Structure 1
Amino acid sequence: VQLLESGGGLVRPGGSLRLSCAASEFTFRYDYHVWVRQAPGKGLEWVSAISGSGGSTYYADSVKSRFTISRDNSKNTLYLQMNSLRAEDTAVYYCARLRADLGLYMDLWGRGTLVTVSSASTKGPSVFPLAPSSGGTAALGCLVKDYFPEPVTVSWNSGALTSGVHTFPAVLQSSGLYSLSSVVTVPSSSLGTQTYICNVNHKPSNTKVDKRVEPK
């Protein structure tokens, strides 16, 4: 007993994508099915529902007139046609069976298929110093802004400085570009006398930057 989604992947803003969901169950045609999506780090959003033989379709207002749910019971397959795709449509899309007992519930779910709505192409980061502010310690760092794709490497003083160093996981922005930050915590007394340099390498764009981070 399973549902399996296919057709996910990369699509440009304004583009179209057709998702398919293959059902193993003989009972497929006797059941409502739905599409539910989940934006990265966010909650479940129900998208669309279709009756056993397609006589009734339901849509969330967020996808109404852009998305069309359909099914081919002869192929035991459910479809979601998505037109005029936007960045906010980026999500894992799940197909699920909707049943009624006393009330409604979704008792069978597919594994999910990632849909990425982005025109992000290879781009080197801008590197900006994050100057220490004017427990006897100062935070300083480097902002690695708007790059694609992953990864970037960051070191401090060519790897000599490790204690106090926290390189944060990158944010994947709605644009489809990444940003990350690296911070080092140092004594405030050191700022006058020590040199702090963040070493950033983004190999895909041949961008390699050594940025001195100084007070003020």
Structure 2
Amino acid sequence: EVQLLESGGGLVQPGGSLRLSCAASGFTFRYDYHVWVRQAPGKGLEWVSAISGSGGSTYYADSVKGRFTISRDNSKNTLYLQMNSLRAEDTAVYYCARLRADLGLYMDLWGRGTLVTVSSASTKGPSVFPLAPSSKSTSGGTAALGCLVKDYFPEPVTVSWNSGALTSGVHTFPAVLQSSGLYSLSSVVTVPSSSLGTQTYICNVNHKPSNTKVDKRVEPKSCD
């Protein structure tokens, strides 16, 4: 397989700096132009920067001239975006892409993208609460259990169940953004009601920006 492995987003203060990496396997990376493209949430794609295979030649959108620097280490098949003097407007998902030319230009190979949040507000890790299936909703076919992942900043969080072994039945909801400027989301899983007396349901909550790596057991309600 041929791929672009992106790393290095997160929260930074206005004026601050961030470094995006993008490592390459499967192709001789050092001959192909690459670029960085970004997308503010709700909004569309904005090309930002590009670099020749060797590094000899580098191009920049006016929105970033003087502030961002594309570079590459061809001995480590790695591409970078050094982002300096960041502003709130730079808040976006940033992709790297390979730039090929056949009759025209096209970006064929893309990284997964990393969120870059530029804010004066602090990193806050979430509180994690178990959402236990009601006494009623169990005596019957199936049970919905969940984890409330409350009051975090910035996005994103991943939620797993049972260390990733339980994927079937899982709906992780997109986060709400409170008047407080903090995010809450919930992840739910439907399971056979009959499995509740014999099976352990652990949600695994990762919020990389706060270094929160939490495990929470969700067990059925008995009250009344």
TM-score normalized by the length of structure 1: 0.59
Task: Evaluate the alpha carbon distance shift between residue 87 and residue 173 of structure 1 in structure 2; reply closer, same or farther with a 3 A threshold.
Answer: farther
TM-superposed CA distance for 1:119, in Å, is 1.5
Task: Evaluate the alpha carbon distance shift between residue 213 and residue 117 of structure 1 in structure 2; reply closer, same or farther with a 3 A threshold.
Answer: same
Highest Rg: 1 or 2?
1
Query: Runs of 5+ in structure 2 lacking a partner?
Result: none
**Which digits, 9 at most, give the CA deviation of each residue in 1:49-92, with x for residues without a partner?**
00000111000000111000000000000000000111111111
TM-superposed CA distance for 1:147, in Å, is 11
When structure 1 is superposed on structure 2, of 160-169 and 21-30 the one drifting more is: 160-169
Contact 2:11 2:123 in 1 (8 A): no
Instruction: Describe how 1:106-121 pairs up with structure 2 within 5 A.
Output: 106-121=107-122
Task: Evaluate the alpha carbon distance shift between residue 116 and residue 74 of structure 1 in structure 2; reply closer, same or farther with a 3 A threshold.
Answer: same
Task: Evaluate the alpha carbon distance shift between residue 159 and residue 118 of structure 1 in structure 2; reply closer, same or farther with a 3 A threshold.
Answer: same
Number of equivalenced pairs = 216
Within 1, Cα distance between the matches of 2:52 and 2:162?
63
TM-superposed CA distance for 1:37, in Å, is 0.5
Query: What's the secondary structure of 1:22's corresponding residue?
Result: strand
Within 1, Cα distance between the matches of 2:27 and 2:199?
72
Task: Evaluate the alpha carbon distance shift between residue 74 and residue 183 of structure 1 in structure 2; reply closer, same or farther with a 3 A threshold.
Answer: closer
Moved over 6 A (4+): 122-171, 177-216
Contact 1:5 1:113 in 2 (8 A): yes
Task: Evaluate the alpha carbon distance shift between residue 32 and residue 200 of structure 1 in structure 2; reply closer, same or farther with a 3 A threshold.
Answer: closer
Task: Evaluate the alpha carbon distance shift between residue 205 and residue 142 of structure 1 in structure 2; reply closer, same or farther with a 3 A threshold.
Answer: same
1:158 aligns with 2:163: yes
TM-score normalized by the length of structure 2: 0.57
Question: What is the RMSD of the two structures over their aligned residues, measured on CA atoms?
Answer: 9.1
Query: What's the secondary structure of 1:26's corresponding residue?
Result: coil
When structure 1 is superposed on structure 2, of 119-128 and 171-180 the one drifting more is: 119-128
TM-superposed CA distance for 1:164, in Å, is 29
Query: What's the secondary structure of 1:158's corresponding residue?
Result: helix
When structure 1 is superposed on structure 2, of 6-15 and 123-132 the one drifting more is: 123-132
Task: Evaluate the alpha carbon distance shift between residue 15 and residue 132 of structure 1 in structure 2; reply closer, same or farther with a 3 A threshold.
Answer: same
Query: Runs of 5+ in structure 1 lacking a partner?
Result: none
When structure 1 is superposed on structure 2, of 181-190 and 40-49 the one drifting more is: 181-190
TM-superposed CA distance for 1:198, in Å, is 31
Fraction of identical pairs, as percent: 99
Task: Evaluate the alpha carbon distance shift between residue 179 and residue 99 of structure 1 in structure 2; reply closer, same or farther with a 3 A threshold.
Answer: same
Task: Evaluate the alpha carbon distance shift between residue 130 and residue 14 of structure 1 in structure 2; reply closer, same or farther with a 3 A threshold.
Answer: farther
Contact 2:117 2:154 in 1 (8 A): no
When structure 1 is superposed on structure 2, of 180-189 and 70-79 the one drifting more is: 180-189
